[PDB]
């Protein structure tokens, strides 16, 4: 999420911000600091975990050829959910 540093400058999704003594803050005087307010780390975390019945599931990102290369995710571990290395969607095997 977008949060402001004590001096008031916004912090980007990469965690970048200028210190209170950094002369480079002069570039924002009379202008604005461009910051994207839709942090991708928050939005992916809002997606529900998909329940599946097989030990191995495939993700192409949705949209077929408009997604990402099809990869196969192993769901044998019960402690954690299998995560797509491309798009971050999580899958869990039904009742292990």
């Amino acid at each position: 999420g977008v949060r402001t540093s004590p001096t008031g400058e916004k912090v980007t999704h990469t965690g970048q911000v200028y210190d209170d003594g950094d002369y480079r803050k002069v570039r924002f005087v009379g202008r604005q600091k461009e910051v994207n307010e839709n942090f991708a780390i928050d939005l992916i975390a809002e997606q529900p975990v998909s329940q599946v019945g097989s030990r191995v599931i495939s993700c192409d990102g949705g949209g077929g050829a408009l997604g990402h290369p099809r990869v196969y995710i192993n769901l044998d571990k019960e402690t954690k959910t299998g995560t797509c290395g491309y798009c971050g969607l999580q899958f869990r095997q039904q009742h292990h």
Binding site: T14, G15, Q16, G30, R31, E34
Partner: protein, 48 residues
């Protein structure tokens, strides 16, 4: 768009902004990476 509207996404801007160059809303480039080398901070108490 009135006959075939665009797909709806919750991250698409609801309000369109025209070219903002020359105004206070213009874009100012900056580096989006954090500092790389951390300097040593001397102790704040005299050794003596």
């Amino acid at each position: 768009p009135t006959v075939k509207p665009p797909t709806a996404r919750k991250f698409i801007w609801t309000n369109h902004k025209f070219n903002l160059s020359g105004t206070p809303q213009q874009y100012v480039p900056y580096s989006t990476t954090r500092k790389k080398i951390q300097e040593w901070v001397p102790p704040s108490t005299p050794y003596k």
